[PDB]
Design a binder for these strands. Structure first.
Lengths: 101, 154, 203, 202, 69, 31
RNA sequence: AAAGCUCCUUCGACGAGUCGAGUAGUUUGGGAAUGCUGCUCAAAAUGGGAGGUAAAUUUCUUCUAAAGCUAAAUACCGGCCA
RNA sequence: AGGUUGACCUCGGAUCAGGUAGGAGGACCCGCUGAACUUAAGCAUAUCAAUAAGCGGAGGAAAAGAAACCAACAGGGAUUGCCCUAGUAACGGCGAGUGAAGCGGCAACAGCUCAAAUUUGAAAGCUGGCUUCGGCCCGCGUUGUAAUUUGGAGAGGAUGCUUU
């Protein structure tokens, strides 16, 4: 942590106190991916397969319409970040489908 | 009753001072319970898995063949959760598993596992990827055959 | 502005029961004190600093001591509420000053604490013996362990040879410069990046 | 455990397997009664995570409710007043169909206490729920300390007062700035804000 | 192996000749992803690929919920 | 229809262990 | 037999027609959506929510939703006793 | 005997054995539904009012409640109530009018429990009946009842004292 400047204005403003590095709280470990969680999710992906909108996005990504696929993913999921993450996931799926073959 | 007799024997054993492990031996039984069998398959301790074909809701066991194939466990779908319950002293049993057996039944377990491997799994390898259903009713099939015969004659 | 355009008369609250409620509160307080004797009627609270720039000059009492404060004081988290120490699992120590102050407060409390045995027949090692179980005690931890210095001392005397030299350029100029740098942190970064990109393009 | 696999599979509701199961179960539940008893939960992982135990005293009822909005029960669609209150269609009930199903199941079973409920299926006309109820007069329930809180008379008809999960959501009982009007009770907060406090030495 | 009677069309539903791409039914049936699905399947099989017979397992590591004593 | 005294006073095993090893002590603070 | 304290290579499961988005009605001081509900779409794994001006990019700070219990301070034109 | 004998699953019957619910009261409390008179020259936004009436559900209190919080600080730390914030921010034919929240002082303070883990060297858990009160049976349950864990952590390992 950068020491504060001891002023009320500007960059790094505030009273000078000696900072402490804390051990990370266990509630902040949410989102960290576990080994058994990866295994269960991959097996369930194998059993279930693709959703219809995922199949449409996969068709668009094979055809190369990346912008159209991201627009469709945004219209389907709701937000730009979720659309981007889903498109990257389906790029990963297509890449590992074609690469190891 | 057998558990009660064993508990009285172990209580006597700890009464004169020897541990319960001196009087009681390692038990070999059929492992049952869905969560227990799933954990055994995940830890790759189960030697043979027998799944029941008539479990509802089917999501309880629909992933079990895929999990057994992914861990390389010999599995077999068998008829009768009540029949497995007769094994495990319950009314029903969704899945049973053999992990270890006694020394005199190693050959029998190996022959049963090999019998499963070349008698069930190799035959169902093609069929397990194939969709079911699609069967027409009796009158629908009769109308279809009549129409097909008329088209062939015409 | 007078807001009486609703049916206000059926929700008028009068406070004729103010002394009766005060007497009821005092009765409850004395009953709780008698039930909790010889322990104090309230639990020990840490010294915390108030949020925002308006109130960070003042310190007050917190909800409870943190787990790190209890660990550094040596008081286990399952023992502290049983000996009268409030525990807060939400609060964190981001600086050493509050941590040291609260650890010293906990050590003072543990030094002034008398622990009667669970069974008087078998006194344990942590339990206080009957020889010094008898001492002058307190019943209000809010009064005995209060906020001694809520605010910094506003008057301090220094000798004339230790007058500080001062910020170079002046304090007003320093404040104006700090505000200017805070407002221009981004434009300067763009111009540095553009100069670096131009140098890279021109090789 | 298998229930992690059931949870991850139940997350995938648009897959072919889950779609087929949902279709056949929706047909079966539509052929059954509007309110009936399920011998076992059709979603055991969901029931377990909502509180169902395989113990004598925990009972599962399946229920379907008609979906859509709420139409005013006014005669011939005429609302007699100002035109801003004159709308009849496109009006929405302020509680969930899950809560309506919970009240109907609780009225069916007046001796039991509605613990919770969950979605199992839906079509164009109906939404289907399975409701978990606890028997407060059963000795196992009264001796289990994890569930014997519901035996107290303060928990009579939780679904009729909104003390279930859907009731708390509909009442907006959440901490934060977005729930300023409703986090402690909307009418109670309104009365606190609208009361006139006159002291003695004012 | 005891097998039941099975209808004539035994694959996934498909109408790949149709050009319409509107709707969930069109996305399920008109879209042809058989090459991708076969790639997933063959990759999964490549990953999968007396006492010896009993203890013979696959090459994947064991998955544990917790460290158990 | 009220719960029995024993049924209302039943506690979990973890609560029993916690109360056994860490009960509400009797203490005092010196002035 | 159970229980706490100290340290640590490693592990560390955490709630889905739910969150969220669009639209409609209603509501709010909440104003390019404050809350609720209906319909449609429909998630993710350092992920998700929030950070009171809509959007992209890069950061930061907070908590950890979709399961549940819990006395006191609080209200009281009903009942009983003063 | 196998055209037989049974085991399960689902759905029923019984004046079966044992229990529970209804109605009252409703000042206060938790929700649903929901006006108009009135005030703005009149008036369909608005106001009255998220009120009256109507409906469902509790208790001595109810509800809320141990952060998917507030904040932007040198950080506070479950809920509730009072004083202040403040007739302020904000909303509104920006008109009539409407209208919070953070911080701060006080009153009172108390924390917790499940799901997601294999006890697997032993369903260790529970309802009911008969008891001679030692227990024994009929069952529930492995599609999961005990112990363990809950994010503050914990699980495993080391370690030496304490604890009942």
């Amino acid at each position: 942590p950068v020491e504060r400047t001891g002023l009320i204005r500007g960059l790094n403003k505030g009273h000078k106190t000696t900072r402490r590095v804390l051990k990370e709280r266990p509630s902040r470990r949410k989102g960290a991916q576990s080994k058994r969680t990866q295994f269960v999710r991959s097996l369930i992906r194998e059993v279930a397969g693709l959703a219809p909108y995922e199949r449409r996005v996969i068709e668009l990504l094979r055809n190369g319409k990346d912008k159209r696929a991201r627009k469709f993913s945004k219209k389907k999921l709701g937000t730009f970040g979720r659309a981007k993450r889903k498109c990257e996931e389906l790029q990963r799926i297509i890449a590992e489908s074609r690469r190891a073959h | 009753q057998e558990k009660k007799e064993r508990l009285l024997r172990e209580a006597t054993a700890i009464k004169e001072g020897k541990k319960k492990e001196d009087v009681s031996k390692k038990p070999y039984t059929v492992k049952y319970g869905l969560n227990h069998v799933v954990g055994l398959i995940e830890n790759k301790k189960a030697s043979l898995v027998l799944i029941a074909n008539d479990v509802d809701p089917i999501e309880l066991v629909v992933f079990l063949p895929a999990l057994c194939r992914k861990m390389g466990i010999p599995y077999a779908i068998i008829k009768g959760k009540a029949r497995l319950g007769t094994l495990v002293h319950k009314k029903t049993a969704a899945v049973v598993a053999i992990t270890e057996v006694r020394s005199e039944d190693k050959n029998e377990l190996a022959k049963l596992i090999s019998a499963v491997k070349e008698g069930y799994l190799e035959k169902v390898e093609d069929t397990r990827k194939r969709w079911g259903g699609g069967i027409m009713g009796f009158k629908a099939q009769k109308r279809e055959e009549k129409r097909k015969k008329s088209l062939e004659t015409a | 502005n007078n807001h009486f355009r609703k049916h206000w008369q059926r929700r008028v609250r009068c406070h004729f029961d103010q002394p009766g409620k005060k007497v009821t509160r005092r009765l409850a307080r004395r009953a709780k004190a008698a039930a909790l004797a010889p322990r104090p009627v309230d639990k020990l609270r840490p010294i915390v600093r108030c949020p925002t720039v308006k109130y960070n000059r003042r310190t007050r009492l917190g909800r409870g001591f943190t787990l790190e404060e209890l660990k550094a004081a040596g008081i286990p988290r399952l023992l502290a509420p049983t000996i009268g120490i409030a525990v807060d699992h939400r609060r964190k120590n981001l600086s050493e000053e509050s941590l040291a102050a609260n650890v010293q407060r906990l050590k003072d409390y543990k030094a002034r604490l008398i622990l009667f045995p669970r069974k008087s027949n078998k006194p344990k090692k942590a339990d206080t013996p009957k020889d010094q179980q008898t001492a002058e005690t307190t019943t209000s931890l809010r009064t005995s362990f209060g906020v001694e210095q809520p605010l910094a001392p506003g008057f301090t005397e220094i000798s004339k040879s230790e007058i500080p030299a001062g910020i170079e350029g002046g304090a007003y100029r320093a404040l104006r410069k700090a505000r200017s740098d805070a407002r221009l942190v981004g434009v300067r970064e763009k111009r540095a990046k553009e100069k670096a990109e131009a140098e890279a393009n021109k090789k | 455990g298998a229930l992690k696999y059931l949870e991850e599979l139940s997350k995938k509701k648009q897959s072919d397997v889950v779609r087929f199961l949902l279709r056949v179960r929706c047909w079966e539940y539509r052929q059954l009664n509007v309110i009936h008893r399920a011998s076992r939960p059709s979603r055991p992982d969901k029931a377990r995570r909502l509180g169902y135990k395989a113990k004598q005293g925990y009972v599962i009822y399946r229920v379907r409710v008609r979906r859509g909005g709420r139409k005013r029960p006014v005669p011939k669609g005429a609302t007699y007043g100002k035109p801003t209150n004159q709308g009849v269609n496109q009006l929405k009930y302020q509680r969930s169909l899950r809560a309506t199903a919970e009240e109907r199941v609780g009225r069916r079973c007046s001796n039991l206490r509605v613990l919770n409920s969950y979605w199992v299926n839906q079509d164009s006309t109906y939404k289907y729920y399975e409701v978990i109820l606890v028997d407060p007069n059963h000795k196992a329930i009264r001796r289990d300390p994890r569930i014997n809180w519901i035996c107290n008379p303060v928990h009579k008809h939780r679904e009729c007062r909104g003390l279930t999960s859907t009731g708390k959501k509909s009442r907006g009982l959440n901490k934060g700035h977005r729930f300023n009007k409703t986090r402690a009770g909307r009418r109670k907060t309104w009365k606190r804000h609208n009361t006139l406090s006159l002291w003695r030495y004012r | 192996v005891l097998k039941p009677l099975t209808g004539d069309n035994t694959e996934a539903p498909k109408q790949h000749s149709q050009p319409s791409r509107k709707g969930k039914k069109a996305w399920r049936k008109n879209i042809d992803l058989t090459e991708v699905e076969q790639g997933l399947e063959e990759l999964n099989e490549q990953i999968i690929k007396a006492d010896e017979i009993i203890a013979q397992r696959s090459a994947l590591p064991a998955v544990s919920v917790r460290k158990r004593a | 229809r009220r719960l029995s005294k024993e049924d209302a006073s039943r506690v979990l095993e973890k609560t029993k262990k916690r109360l056994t090893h860490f009960p509400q002590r009797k203490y005092a603070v010196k002035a």
